[PDB]
Amino acid sequence: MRVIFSEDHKLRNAKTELYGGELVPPFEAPFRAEWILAAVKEAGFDDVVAPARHGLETVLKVHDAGYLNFLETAWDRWKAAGYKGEAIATSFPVRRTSPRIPTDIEGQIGYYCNAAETAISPGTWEAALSSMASAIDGADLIAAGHKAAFSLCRPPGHHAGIDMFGGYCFINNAAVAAQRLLDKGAKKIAILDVDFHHGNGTQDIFYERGDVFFASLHGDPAEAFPHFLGYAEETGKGAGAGTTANYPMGRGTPYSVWGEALTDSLKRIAAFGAEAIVVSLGVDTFEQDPISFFKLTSPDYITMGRTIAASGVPLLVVMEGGYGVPEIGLNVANVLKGVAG
Amino acid sequence: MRVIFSEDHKLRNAKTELYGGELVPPFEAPFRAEWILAAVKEAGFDDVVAPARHGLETVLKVHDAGYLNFLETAWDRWKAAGYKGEAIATSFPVRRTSPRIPTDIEGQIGYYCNAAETAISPGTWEAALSSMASAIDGADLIAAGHKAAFSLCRPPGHHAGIDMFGGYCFINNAAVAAQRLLDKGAKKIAILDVDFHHGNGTQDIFYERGDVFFASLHGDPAEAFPHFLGYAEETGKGAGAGTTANYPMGRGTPYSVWGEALTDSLKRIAAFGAEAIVVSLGVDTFEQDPISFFKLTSPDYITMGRTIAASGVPLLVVMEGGYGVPEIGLNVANVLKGVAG
Ligand SMILES: NCCCNCCCCCC(=O)NO
Ligand SMILES: NCCCNCCCCCC(=O)NO
Ligand SMILES: [K+]
Ligand SMILES: [K+]
Ligand SMILES: [N+]
Ligand SMILES: [N+]
Ligand SMILES: [Zn+2]
Ligand SMILES: [Zn+2]
């Protein structure tokens, strides 16, 4: 099983994250990619290749052009405005605001952000483009006939919506991969988001689209980030009617419960007729994850990968979250073992 | 004229404000009230009295009850959740989010916030209630027949909307005062917001109401906080049709230009038939203000107060912003000299 990974993830090495009212070093840090890469190699997945670079063709079909233009120059503009910290939004277009886009950097960073814990730092845009490239090359392997591949994306993607960054995410890698599979000839694709957090960005991108089914298992947004999307009642609008499926779950959820939601999501995906599944894999569902409240064990990730692959359709696994301990690597490698076994 | 002021403002003494990606000492600090009080006394306004306390009768008519309940316990809940810094929102209900209210403190602080530079700290709620009380007692003096009074509010109020805090504000003191005047028998009231920043909170509270005319002169929101309201096209909705008037202005605006907008706003207020005007007075229009881009001089504040009082209707002056230098006091005192002269 080929692993696509760019060393350019390291260009995002942000100094700060707003957490508990303090500016602390970020949870989503380069050591994550080091730990995951080492563990997948240790598990025998040593066919590791860098992605080819890609321009914006595919990503323009899932993200707004203004948003992408904003990300490309955000750091330069923040620095030119004289601010001394990293680029962190403060004002947001919340209830009953104007829809207009501000012109200056402080207004625009808020316009284009859903979550202020995520700072833009020098190298962020380049890192995000490299992470997108890993997702695109992974998709191309699936399009060309492989039944499994792993895109070791960093930074992650699933909180990036049509025109907003947040939750450590800038470009929605999984969305780009799904779009790439459609562009290569698929008519129906599913994204299955097993990260602890709701993929609100992914949901947003496809909410009014019927070509990509979106399923997410996650901490209940009533008491988990991203807080403002991910309820079970959200099933899609217009052309997207019936193609969003959210499975919010509570504190302490173990695999015996979580796996029942996985089974149901896979039934939904099969009834939709997905030609391939892009798996948004976060391992922050782990019982020792520092920011999450599920209780999956390391062996459960093998079961998970096996069950998803038993769909009998090709899988692209795209890396999302999972923090704090190097066992994030074991957990990811275990999903791949379940897929490959 | 009487000056209403509570020493309980000092219960808000937050340690941090997110500015330029750093946590810095807040601009809206207790020493402001000290500077202002000393200067007004120096100018001969020494009839200074503490407000009587007030319950929530008036404020419940302009703010949402869930919002007020949230503010009352926000600090305690944040601390109980184990966070080490002051209480600062990071996730926000922005474009295309669920309207649902989260249950936990992190979700709720974002739900009820429009701007993350403002941290909730111990004593914030009590301070905000004392500031509201100063506004209510000021309104009561006007209702009883005084032609002018000054409510030395701190914390300020004009960024607090129906159900959101931000911009250093928690309870919209000016909105509470206007409501109090209606409750005491007025049928039409105006709020005139001359602080540099758009009073988006005030606008929100009255946008669909026809009993309170709202006029604001301010830095253009395309390039100034609050960024997402304050455009000239916003003239009201429903019962509030035609009773919001915004005058956005650009960098370097001096009194020769700003005063023309003031004249127009007073024309609008007179045609509406306001029985009294609540003046949201920020002196962050000053040429030295550290966070603002207008160029008013200290003598211009006398002109401003005279012009507003030449409306010939009673005024309640309610303190908003103005930062950095002790001359904030001279500037406030000069508005009062213009009113009283
Ligand atoms: N108790 C608060 C935990 C941190 N809250 C915001 C972090 C964003 C997490 C994004 C992520 O990992 N997404 O997959
Ligand atoms: N360049 C950033 C300067 C600070 N930006 C937002 C501060 C909030 C000001 C609120 C205020 O003073 N309202 O009257
Ligand atoms: K998820
Ligand atoms: K104003
Ligand atoms: N969808
Ligand atoms: N209004
Ligand atoms: Zn996650
Ligand atoms: Zn101001």
Side-chain angles (χ1 to χ4, degrees), chain A residues 1-105 107-341, chain B residues 1-105 107-186 188-341:
Chain A
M1 180 194 310
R2 180 155 284 190
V3 174
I4 314 293
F5 172 64
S6 179
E7 297 290 346
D8 287 342
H9 75 90
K10 179 63 166 300
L11 296 173
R12 183 160 164 87
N13 200 357
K15 298 177 185 182
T16 65
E17 169 175 345
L18 183 58
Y19 174 79
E22 303 186 309
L23 288 167
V24 299
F27 285 98
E28 202 303 88
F31 56 72
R32 293 175 66 253
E34 301 170 355
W35 292 346
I36 295 164
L37 185 66
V40 303
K41 289 175 180 172
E42 188 181 357
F45 302 104
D46 52 22
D47 180 19
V48 178
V49 300
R53 64 92 50 191
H54 294 277
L56 303 183
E57 172 185 296
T58 312
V59 66
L60 284 165
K61 299 181 190 186
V62 289
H63 286 294
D64 175 80
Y67 171 65
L68 298 178
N69 281 333
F70 161 80
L71 292 176
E72 193 152 46
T73 61
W75 174 254
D76 289 331
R77 291 173 70 209
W78 181 261
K79 183 168 160 55
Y83 301 119
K84 297 179 288 178
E86 296 178 318
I88 298 173
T90 50
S91 286
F92 291 85
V94 290
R95 292 182 294 280
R96 300 181 300 277
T97 50
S98 177
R100 290 183 178 280
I101 310 184
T103 59
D104 61 352
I105 188 55
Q108 291 197 349
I109 192 167
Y111 180 88
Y112 287 118
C113 183
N114 63 36
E117 79 292 318
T118 296
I120 290 170
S121 62
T124 289
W125 174 241
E126 298 282 356
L129 289 171
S130 80
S131 192
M132 178 194 72
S134 291
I136 291 170
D137 271 20
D140 283 353
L141 288 171
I142 299 305
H146 285 5
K147 290 184 182 309
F150 176 47
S151 294
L152 204 176
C153 292
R154 178 181 178 272
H158 69 152
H159 300 300
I162 292 168
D163 53 4
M164 50 199 154
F165 77 95
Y168 315 156
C169 302
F170 308 90
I171 291 174
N172 194 318
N173 305 309
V176 176
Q179 184 66 52
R180 186 72 168 202
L181 293 171
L182 294 170
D183 291 353
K184 289 286 186 184
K187 296 175 168 38
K188 297 187 106 178
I189 294 294
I191 296 170
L192 174 58
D193 186 326
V194 297
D195 185 288
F196 169 77
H197 302 93
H198 180 237
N200 57 317
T202 315
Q203 177 170 312
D204 187 51
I205 290 167
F206 301 106
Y207 201 58
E208 300 185 35
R209 282 174 67 165
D211 50 358
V212 180
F213 189 97
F214 178 67
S216 180
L217 283 60
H218 46 269
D220 183 358
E223 58 179 330
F225 186 94
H227 314 284
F228 305 109
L229 210 61
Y231 293 94
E233 64 189 356
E234 304 154 17
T235 59
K237 291 180 86 251
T243 65
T244 294
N246 284 322
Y247 297 84
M249 291 174 262
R251 294 181 170 272
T253 296
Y255 199 79
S256 65
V257 175
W258 191 99
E260 293 170 352
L262 183 63
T263 294
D264 197 71
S265 74
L266 287 165
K267 286 172 180 158
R268 293 296 314 281
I269 286 164
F272 168 80
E275 297 169 55
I277 303 168
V278 175
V279 181
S280 267
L281 174 60
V283 292
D284 40 11
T285 49
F286 186 45
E287 60 188 343
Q288 303 302 334
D289 193 271
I291 65 171
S292 308
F293 60 59
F294 290 172
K295 298 295 182 192
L296 271 61
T297 67
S298 296
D300 291 327
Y301 293 100
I302 307 178
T303 312
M304 184 194 304
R306 184 178 308 112
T307 293
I308 296 169
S311 65
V313 309
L315 303 184
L316 176 64
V317 181
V318 175
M319 192 68 219
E320 304 284 358
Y323 305 97
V325 293
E327 284 67 45
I328 64 174
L330 170 62
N331 294 336
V332 169
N334 278 358
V335 178
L336 304 185
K337 289 182 174 186
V339 171
Chain B
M1 89 182 63
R2 184 153 276 193
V3 174
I4 313 291
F5 170 66
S6 177
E7 294 289 346
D8 287 345
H9 78 90
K10 73 180 98 302
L11 299 172
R12 182 158 164 88
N13 185 27
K15 302 172 191 176
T16 67
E17 169 175 346
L18 190 54
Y19 173 83
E22 303 185 310
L23 287 168
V24 303
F27 286 100
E28 202 303 83
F31 59 74
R32 295 173 62 248
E34 310 173 343
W35 284 341
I36 297 166
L37 187 65
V40 303
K41 287 172 176 178
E42 192 175 344
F45 304 103
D46 49 26
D47 180 19
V48 177
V49 299
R53 65 89 53 190
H54 296 276
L56 302 183
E57 171 186 299
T58 312
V59 68
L60 280 165
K61 299 178 190 187
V62 289
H63 287 295
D64 173 80
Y67 171 66
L68 298 175
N69 284 338
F70 161 81
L71 291 176
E72 188 178 277
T73 59
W75 175 254
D76 290 337
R77 292 172 69 212
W78 181 262
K79 188 180 171 189
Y83 299 119
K84 289 184 271 271
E86 298 178 323
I88 297 173
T90 47
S91 284
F92 291 84
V94 289
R95 291 183 297 279
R96 300 181 300 276
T97 50
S98 175
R100 292 185 177 278
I101 309 184
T103 59
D104 64 357
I105 189 54
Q108 290 199 348
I109 194 169
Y111 179 89
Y112 286 119
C113 184
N114 61 38
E117 80 290 318
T118 296
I120 290 170
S121 57
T124 289
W125 174 241
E126 297 278 357
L129 289 173
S130 78
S131 190
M132 175 194 76
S134 291
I136 290 170
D137 269 20
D140 284 354
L141 290 171
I142 298 308
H146 287 215
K147 290 189 182 305
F150 176 46
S151 292
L152 205 177
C153 294
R154 177 180 179 276
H158 68 151
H159 298 301
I162 294 170
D163 54 3
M164 44 195 162
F165 76 97
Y168 316 153
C169 301
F170 308 89
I171 293 175
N172 194 319
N173 306 308
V176 174
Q179 185 66 52
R180 188 73 167 200
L181 293 169
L182 296 169
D183 291 353
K184 290 290 195 174
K188 282 181 169 212
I189 293 293
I191 298 170
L192 174 60
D193 188 325
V194 297
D195 184 288
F196 169 77
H197 302 93
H198 181 237
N200 56 318
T202 315
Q203 181 171 310
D204 187 52
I205 288 166
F206 299 106
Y207 201 61
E208 299 182 32
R209 284 174 63 164
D211 50 1
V212 180
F213 191 98
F214 179 66
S216 179
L217 283 61
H218 47 269
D220 179 3
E223 59 179 331
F225 186 93
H227 313 286
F228 304 109
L229 210 59
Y231 292 95
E233 67 188 353
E234 299 156 20
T235 59
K237 167 180 185 281
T243 61
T244 292
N246 284 322
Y247 298 85
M249 290 175 271
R251 289 179 172 275
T253 296
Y255 197 81
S256 66
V257 175
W258 191 98
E260 294 168 352
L262 183 65
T263 295
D264 197 71
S265 75
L266 290 164
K267 274 188 176 97
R268 293 295 311 281
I269 286 167
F272 172 75
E275 295 169 56
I277 300 168
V278 175
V279 181
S280 266
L281 173 61
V283 293
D284 43 7
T285 52
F286 184 47
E287 63 190 341
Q288 296 178 226
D289 193 272
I291 65 171
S292 309
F293 61 57
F294 289 173
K295 296 298 179 193
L296 273 60
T297 66
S298 296
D300 290 327
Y301 294 98
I302 307 178
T303 312
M304 184 192 302
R306 182 178 307 105
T307 294
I308 297 169
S311 63
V313 305
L315 306 181
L316 177 63
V317 181
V318 173
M319 192 67 219
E320 303 284 359
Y323 307 99
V325 292
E327 288 71 31
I328 66 172
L330 171 63
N331 297 333
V332 171
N334 276 359
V335 180
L336 305 186
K337 286 181 170 185
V339 171

